[PDB]
Amino acid sequence: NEDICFIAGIGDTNGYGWGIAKELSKRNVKIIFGIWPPVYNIFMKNYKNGKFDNDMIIDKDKKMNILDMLPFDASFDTANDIDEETKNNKRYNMLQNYTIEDVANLIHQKYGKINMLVHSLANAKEVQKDLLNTSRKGYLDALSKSSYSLISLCKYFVNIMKPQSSIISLTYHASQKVVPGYGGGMSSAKAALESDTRVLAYHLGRNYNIRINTISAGPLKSRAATAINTFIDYAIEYSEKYAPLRQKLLSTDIGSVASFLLSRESRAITGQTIYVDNGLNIMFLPD
Amino acid sequence: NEDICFIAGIGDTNGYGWGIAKELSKRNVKIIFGIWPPVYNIFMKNYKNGKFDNDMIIDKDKKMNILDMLPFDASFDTANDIDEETKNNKRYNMLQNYTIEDVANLIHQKYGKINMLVHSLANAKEVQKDLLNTSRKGYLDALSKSSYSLISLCKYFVNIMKPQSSIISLTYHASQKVVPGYGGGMSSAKAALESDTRVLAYHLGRNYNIRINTISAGPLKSRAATAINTFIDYAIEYSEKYAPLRQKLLSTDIGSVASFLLSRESRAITGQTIYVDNGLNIMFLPD
Amino acid sequence: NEDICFIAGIGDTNGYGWGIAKELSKRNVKIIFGIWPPVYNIFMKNYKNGKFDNDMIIDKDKKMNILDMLPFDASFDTANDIDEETKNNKRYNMLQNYTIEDVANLIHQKYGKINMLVHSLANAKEVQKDLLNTSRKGYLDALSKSSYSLISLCKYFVNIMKPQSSIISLTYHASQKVVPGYGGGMSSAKAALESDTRVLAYHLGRNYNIRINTISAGPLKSRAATAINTFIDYAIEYSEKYAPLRQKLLSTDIGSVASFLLSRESRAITGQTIYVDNGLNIMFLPD
Amino acid sequence: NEDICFIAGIGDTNGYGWGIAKELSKRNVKIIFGIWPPVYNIFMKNYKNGKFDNDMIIDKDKKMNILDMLPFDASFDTANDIDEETKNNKRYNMLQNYTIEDVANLIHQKYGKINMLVHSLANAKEVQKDLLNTSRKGYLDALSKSSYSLISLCKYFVNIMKPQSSIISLTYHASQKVVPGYGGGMSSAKAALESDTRVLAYHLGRNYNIRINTISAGPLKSRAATAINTFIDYAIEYSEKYAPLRQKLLSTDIGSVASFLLSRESRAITGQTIYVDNGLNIMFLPD
Ligand SMILES: NC(=O)c1ccc[n+]([C@@H]2O[C@H](COP(=O)([O-])OP(=O)(O)OC[C@H]3O[C@@H](n4cnc5c(N)ncnc54)[C@H](O)[C@@H]3O)[C@@H](O)[C@H]2O)c1
Ligand SMILES: NC(=O)c1ccc[n+]([C@@H]2O[C@H](COP(=O)([O-])OP(=O)(O)OC[C@H]3O[C@@H](n4cnc5c(N)ncnc54)[C@H](O)[C@@H]3O)[C@@H](O)[C@H]2O)c1
Ligand SMILES: NC(=O)c1ccc[n+]([C@@H]2O[C@H](COP(=O)([O-])OP(=O)(O)OC[C@H]3O[C@@H](n4cnc5c(N)ncnc54)[C@H](O)[C@@H]3O)[C@@H](O)[C@H]2O)c1
Ligand SMILES: NC(=O)c1ccc[n+]([C@@H]2O[C@H](COP(=O)([O-])OP(=O)(O)OC[C@H]3O[C@@H](n4cnc5c(N)ncnc54)[C@H](O)[C@@H]3O)[C@@H](O)[C@H]2O)c1
Ligand SMILES: O=Cc1ccc(Oc2ccccc2)c(O)c1
Ligand SMILES: O=Cc1ccc(Oc2ccccc2)c(O)c1
Ligand SMILES: O=Cc1ccc(Oc2ccccc2)c(O)c1
Ligand SMILES: O=Cc1ccc(Oc2ccccc2)c(O)c1
Fold this sequence. Notes:
The structure is a homotetramer.
Chain A: E1 4-10, H1 16-26, E2 30-35, H2 37-48, E3 57-58, E4 62-63, E5 66-71, H3 84-88, H4 90-93, H5 100-111, E6 114-119, H6 136-157, E7 161-171, H7 186-208, E8 211-217, H8 231-242, H9 251-261, E9 273-276
Parallel strand pairs in A: 1-2, 1-6, 2-5, 6-7, 7-8, 8-9
Antiparallel strand pairs in A: 3-4
Bound molecules: nicotinamide-adenine-dinucleotide (4 copies) and 3-hydroxy-4-phenoxybenzaldehyde (4 copies).
One 3-hydroxy-4-phenoxybenzaldehyde (FT0) is lined by residues 122-124, 127, 172, 186, 219, 224-225, 232, 235 of chain C.
């Protein structure tokens, strides 16, 4: 009924960004994707070649309602931030207005004010290297894209939101307890994301009456998951064997939580980490 | 269709039990009230004389679908647990089948298996007495009636519940952080309840595919809350000034979260303490 | 000079009570044993016949400074709490002043005020029964003897303790995370104990300038531990393979931390759960 | 007895680095300071002009034993990392071998292997700006100097340590609960430090048998504390009024904890956050 959500960080339909997009369509929210420049063109190709038709079907006679699809790179806050190499690059040269600020500006100009923000991107150049052999550049690159991205997104997008808006992002338990293969300081990144959620909760709550929470999802065989080193195959088999609920976790599991988290229905919740993981986090010794 | 919920711990319309009842009605769920015999007769007259008429009111013209209302005492697991005095006591003499087991059976015989369970009750003889000054009897009292009852409610009610059912209870932050005024061992009962929710999610999740969670509610001006001597006004005045969301917290705010948690929509959440308190728990220092 | 410590919960030399006793001796602290009457006479013979001779041995030639050894039952707060059967029971008939209050007074009359208190005891009638299958009696039993005793030990022992004294107890991670095998409501008692340590730090810190903390010990092969049916071998084999510190965890490892926490050296620590388990709690997935 | 500790991040004697250095001298550990380049020369001047004589006195006839005092900038891992501006700068031109790697190399060459590491530096260019108006550069600068510094320090210094060595760093509660004035992403930085401690604990434990923990200190009117915006004056008055223990927290309070944390006496502790804050963290509602 004139609800519009922006989802940062889709590349295909095997991630949580898709799951979140499915479920929100059930509540008749219009969807706008933010797609990372280097995969935008291919994503666009697949969409037009119908690769995703099936994944867009919902309930009885309802389709997913994609208002727009835009290039978006969470590396850059303004135009002033893009370096000579990136600008010059084959992926980027063909596109424009993909910075955090340019995307707020562009959405707002095309469609007016929105009321739903989702952060659903992570990126860590050295993810495959354990924390101890992670370099300074790789650590900060991880923090920049995976965590600072959240603050920037909030900082530009509050302007174009209505009061009583909601914002989520996705996190992982590795921030609280040691996950051996989750390297490159994605642990570190997730650590800070959760803490920033509490801090943003305070500022966004008192100064605009906008809520923010994060969802701590169990494992899901996504594009990004397979970039780690298998690891994600072990995480899935372990989860389905030792979690208090022995069923397959689905992107739409997280999706529905996000939708309730994004609705008036959770008015009294903010600054929280909510686990959507079939209860895995509560276990100590595997039985 | 056929979503029946048993709510244990209703005494009036000023409580969280009522907020839950209301919000659950909006979803077209059938409700069954479980009412402590010390207040059961006075609840019935009040109701029959339509004194809750204005509080049964939902949305535009819609009323509350209360299926049945049953005397219920969370102290007694089965008919044999009942001591001679209580069976003979003025307010118990006239009443039948009010133990945890008889209530479970009666619900089954009368209505068949259900799919939702709310634990919404607490008791402590020595609530006015700070923990150090609490006698062994008072402690155990508080533990028995506020913490053990949930365990039992589970034991007897899994029998009459469908797989994929959901169970919630209510807790208070004092379990995690020091709150002067919350005595009797209540903080002890709360800690117990929150840890017991984890262990039960393991059992119920693996053994029956049933979910259990708890809601750490913020302050509400209920009958029970004024029994603390007032502590509650202070705690409300405090939440309304320092929380991120500076807005009155309503029984229905908790209600609608209970609705979510109790529905399929929370499929992948189990064993959790969900905070519904406008974010106060995340604060450290005031301003 | 004049550092006297009362240790509640000693039955043999295979326990944490003994590790604490040993390490405290190295600091030249005077020890007073509090021994459950069901094992008091058998402890005395064993001791007198010098069967603990090799376990009383510290460093190069130094022995254990055991000042006195007293029958003690954490079930009874005062002489009036004692039921006729127990007073008449074979193992209690011969013994005097073994309640929490008489023990406090006797210690004071015999030795004056002390400055250190160890709570090192636990009990649960139904430990073999998983939580869901625990009867109301067993639950309350476990809560009474493992959680309430600490509260009381405080109530009666603050009277005979100097300002700047310190009090510790022992807990187990199962309060925070699900550990199958830990039944009887023990996990409930542990959660209770950890929250009760916070509330008591408030009271004791403001009102008497006395410190209280708890140690979440890792697995140890003690008398009590084999009573769980074995659960303990599994848990040791597990800790030794997956913990960060792959090295046997010894009663004295906990002992020396108890020493630290009990000394002035921990002046600014109160209300905390300190983990001493080679770091196992921080793990999520095995390898 | 041939124990050597390295303390990164002293500038004067009002910080925790001094407190840690005092206490470790009581146990006859030789001390080596790491001093940030821009204050090295002045620090050195004061030392020689005797400004610190009084602050170096310990117990009866013992002085603080400062083995060496070296320039150290946690911004730079190797020689290859220092830029043309810094190299050219007035502070830096007069000094040499101040990178994390060069300091390990230099200590090791002069004095052989050490067994004690302390991390005791924080730095946030935008600390005075709340999280939401913190820029990308300021956020990452905070993370680089305050958190990544820990990993690098461990990464170079393991080489020059003995097995069974210990490492600490200092953190603040703001990582767990909202502290309004603690801006520029020092919250974020502290968040990640605590999470990295658990992760390093795992690698350093399994691969070298070296422990690591962090201490969460209450407020102390230090040089750096006064750089924030007062804020530290409020934090101190609040602490001494509402903490369970109403006494002044001293750098030597933290010091003694560090010393026990750094000794064989805590062999079974790793990967932990330990609160040294007079119990402040346990409170919810101020009484
Ligand atoms: N997949 C899991 O198993 C799992 C478990 C817990 C948490 N999470 C979290 O959920 C989020 C989504 O994960 P996913 O599995 O859906 O991965 P995904 O690959 O499906 O989605 C992440 C997307 O973010 C985009 N992206 C990367 N860098 C970017 C940048 N600099 N600017 C803009 N966009 C960028 C990529 O195009 C990628 O498609 C992640 O942040 C992850 O931390 C995932
Ligand atoms: N009031 C708050 O601010 C607050 C904050 C956090 C959590 N909670 C939780 O909410 C729950 C309900 O509290 P409330 O504030 O709505 O007060 P309430 O009076 O509505 O709830 C207590 C109700 O439980 C019933 N009851 C008491 N003992 C019983 C027994 N032995 N058997 C059956 N029923 C019994 C009484 O009829 C009473 O109506 C409590 O469990 C409390 O832990 C309340
Ligand atoms: N064993 C472990 O692996 C482990 C792990 C974490 C915590 N702990 C804690 O350590 C404590 C001691 O356990 P343990 O493993 O040394 O076994 P233990 O047998 O040494 O300790 C129990 C002792 O308490 C005494 N006791 C029992 N009931 C008593 C009562 N009513 N009054 C007075 N004394 C009584 C018994 O004499 C017995 O010796 C327990 O409280 C437990 O919670 C143990
Ligand atoms: N002071 C408090 O109230 C307080 C409370 C909790 C935690 N802490 C933590 O304790 C630590 C010490 O704090 P403090 O109050 O002693 O401050 P301090 O100023 O006494 O010590 C910090 C020192 O680190 C040095 N430093 C800064 N940037 C550096 C760099 N890039 N490379 C090398 N050295 C650098 C500075 O010279 C400074 O003297 C801090 O990390 C802080 O996060 C402090
Ligand atoms: O299930 C575990 C898991 C899988 C993928 C994740 O996202 C990443 C994005 C980029 C690099 C690394 C991970 C993640 O956060 C957790
Ligand atoms: O706002 C705090 C608060 C108020 C009332 C509560 O219910 C109780 C019912 C009986 C005894 C004690 C508490 C409670 O749990 C928390
Ligand atoms: O290693 C785990 C463990 C083993 C023994 C324990 O002591 C108990 C004493 C009596 C009843 C239950 C437990 C305990 O607390 C934890
Ligand atoms: O007591 C609070 C407090 C004071 C100072 C701190 O260190 C800082 C170092 C550099 C910039 C900002 C803070 C800190 O971490 C916490």
